[PDB]
């Protein structure tokens, strides 16, 4: 059996790793970041202050969806916790 919290944690680590690597140029880190941000509809994490501020700055969060402001963002860690706890679907 694979435990919810163990994979959620591993998924946030994977993502935090790619976020780091992305901000030191590693064109693949950037692809992973863009993928996570588009598929999960998120941008950075509040838990990752230093990395999140380097990242907006890198224009790795398009909006598209955003029609009023692009100032406000979902936290990817929270999106990952909610994916594994089955809380992302529009019921």
């Amino acid at each position, epitope marked *: 059996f694979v435990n919810k919290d163990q994979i959620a944690k591993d998924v946030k680590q994977f993502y935090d790793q790619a976020l780091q690597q992305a901000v030191v140029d590693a064109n693949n880190a950037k692809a992973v970041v863009k993928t996570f941000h588009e598929t999960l509809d998120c941008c950075g*994490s*509040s838990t990752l202050t230093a990395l999140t501020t380097s990242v907006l700055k890198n*224009n790795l969060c398009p*909006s598209g*969806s*955003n*029609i*009023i*402001s*692009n*100032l*406000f*963002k*979902e*936290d990817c*860690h*929270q*999106k990952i*916790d*909610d994916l594994f706890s089955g*809380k*992302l679907h*529009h*019921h």
Partner: single-chain antibody
Amino acid sequence: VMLVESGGGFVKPGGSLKLSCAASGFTFRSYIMSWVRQTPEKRLEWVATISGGGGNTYYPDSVKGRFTISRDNAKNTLYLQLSSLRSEDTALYYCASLTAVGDYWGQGTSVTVSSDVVMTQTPLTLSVTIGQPASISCKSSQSLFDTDGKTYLTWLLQRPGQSPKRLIYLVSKLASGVPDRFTGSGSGTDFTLKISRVEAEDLGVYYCLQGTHFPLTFGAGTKLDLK
């Protein structure tokens, strides 16, 4: 369909109150939710914004450190804890999905405390006759043109008795349930709402709103009136 606010009231300088907003009829948890206050003089001010999942909270400096926005997704409730309250915090506080794809507003709950891009709007009052063309200007102190290549200029209209409602976003794009008598235009710092032939549900207060620069700011408003 519904946002219902409560917990407003009357308080002394330096006191506390916690406001609530009960949502129903949309997928609450996936909306970035806001509080927007409207002062006795009918100015709108952005107060706080929280991400769908609760992780990112945002505040202008005027309330930052004093107010805490929060949300309970399982209960479909939005909160605003008010503390160290000041006279100039007196206003009608609106729960709203202000920046979300759908435009929902509560009806507002009132607080009375009692012992940045400048947005300009010309004229302050337009009095008109039904079927007349109308033209309101909104001017900003910096370009609202984002790196996005989007221009986050938004028009809202508050009808007498009514909470405010989105009418135009991204300068020219009409919101839902909005007729084509409405037309927004402009670029840079200069923006224009034209009503070709005013009908009687065009009357109220028009506000522009920029979303390009932190913190969110509102023009003081133009009153549409007949005569």
